[PDB]
């Protein structure tokens, strides 16, 4: 209560391994969320790869033919010969959209399914796509679904990317970062088991979409073997499993570096620091690693911790890192989508970050961005639709504090978005905590 135990030492592994050693030596892992339109084929898609890693019945192929303490996000973890990886739900409903933007805000990157039969991406969809990359996904590979009802016609598949292509980047997507696969999904072709036909073969050379996520996650798996002890440890909670040791099991994905049974960690906003005597992992989580590493969905097993004060959407991190704050006002790097009234000091909305949403408003605007990131000298008195600007925000109808990080800390827990009305109307880095 008035304290929790606190120390910024940090405590030795029971069993000390070389992490990039233990990198090198383990399968690449990778989570990702499917979006897309419902008549774009997301669900029989996704029973297809699942039928193909044996997971799903063939009745249950065909009849698709046609807990925590609370729950933030839905996980799936499957895995192939080459590599691990983990589902995670964004429901695409008009009225789950919050729920999207939980499990989005989760994913290392996305899959967007896509109608090519008899090219105009829906709102909703739209909506997502921009969601995506404003919470810092930068990878995409779009499934350019049911080629059947255009007989695998390269022309339809040249057009729709020639018209989606350029609408993802002014979005902030770059070309590099998005890969196209053309699936059957009636049949499989395209998905994992079931091969392209020599005729698909002819103009199309490329991977299928399992290669194709495979190698996604290979890449990330280059990255971690770099990771140090000096790397800060960074986890987010997704959820509190439910003595006397003060043992609690809490769920969530590492942002950064890792962590060893035998090291400790303090959990923000609460500030009570835990060691943690067991990792477990995979579907299970009597599976039990001695290591996790960014990426990671694992379980922690924590000693000395106090649950009441733990929630979903929590940060926690190495003992010794300090960049981690509890704050009223910060200031956003500001980008404005299509708005239907322009933002004034005062404005309120709903911010969302990682997978907690808060009610706040604009405290000041402060500058436009005329360049990168300088600082315009035309004074702003409001801030309409497509302006980037810098903000500073106030949150209001504060319950219990948010754990903040920067987005030059962690460029992926430091995204914001805004939202007012229920339409998206801003994305935002975190400059600056005025804590």
Not at 93 to 122: E, K, W, Y
Not at 174 to 194: A, C, L, Q, R
Request: charged share 25%; hydrophobic share 40%; with cysteine.
């Amino acid at each position: 209560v008035q304290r929790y135990y606190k120390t910024t030492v940090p405590t030795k592994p029971k069993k000390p391994h070389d992490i990039s050693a233990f990198v090198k030596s383990a399968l690449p892992h990778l989570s990702f969320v499917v979006l897309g339109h419902v008549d774009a084929g997301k669900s029989t898609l996704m029973g297809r790869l699942l039928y193909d890693l044996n997971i799903v019945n063939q009745s249950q192929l065909r009849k698709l033919q046609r807990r925590g303490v609370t729950v933030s996000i839905c996980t799936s973890h499957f895995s192939t010969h080459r590599a691990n990886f983990t589902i995670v739900d964004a429901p695409g409903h008009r009225d789950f959209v919050p729920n999207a933007i939980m499990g989005i805000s989760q994913a290392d990157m996305a899959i967007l399914c896509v109608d090519c039969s008899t090219f105009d991406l829906d709102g909703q969809t739209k909506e997502h796509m921009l969601l995506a990359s404003s919470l810092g996904i930068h990878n995409l590979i779009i499934a350019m679904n049911k080629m059947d009802n255009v007989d695998w016609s390269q022309q339809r598949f040249e057009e729709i990317k020639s018209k989606l292509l350029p609408y993802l980047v002014d979005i902030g997507f770059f070309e590099d970062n998005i890969n196209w696969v053309p699936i059957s999904g009636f049949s499989g072709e395209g998905v994992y088991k079931i091969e392209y036909t020599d005729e698909v073969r002819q103009w199309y050379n490329g991977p299928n979409l399992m290669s194709t996520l495979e190698n996604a996650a290979f890449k990330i798996s280059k990255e971690n073997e770099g990771i140090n002890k000096d790397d800060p440890f960074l986890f987010s909670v997704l959820e509190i499993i439910p003595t006397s040791n003060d043992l609690a099991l809490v769920s969530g994905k590492l942002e950064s570096g890792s962590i060893q049974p035998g090291e400790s960690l303090t959990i923000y906003p609460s500030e009570q620091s835990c060691i943690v005597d067991k990792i477990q992992v995979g579907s299970q989580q009597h599976e039990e690693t001695d290591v996790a590493i960014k990426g990671d969905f694992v379980t922690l097993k924590l000693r000395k911790a106090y649950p009441e004060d733990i929630q979903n959407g929590d940060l926690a991190a190495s003992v010794d890192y300090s960049s981690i704050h509890s704050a009223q006002c910060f200031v956003l790097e500001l980008t404005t989508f299509d708005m239907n009234r322009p933002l004034l000091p005062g404005t309120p909305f709903i911010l969302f970050i990682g997978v907690k949403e808060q009610p706040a408003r604009i405290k000041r605007l402060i500058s436009f961005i005329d360049k990168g990131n300088t600082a315009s000298k035309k004074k702003i008195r409001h801030l309409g639709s497509k302006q980037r600007a810098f903000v500073e925000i106030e949150l209001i109808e504060v319950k219990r504090w948010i754990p903040l990080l920067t987005a030059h800390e962690n460029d992926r827990l430091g995204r914001v978005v805004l939202r007012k009305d229920g339409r998206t109307i801003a994305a935002g880095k975190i400059s600056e905590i005025t804590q």
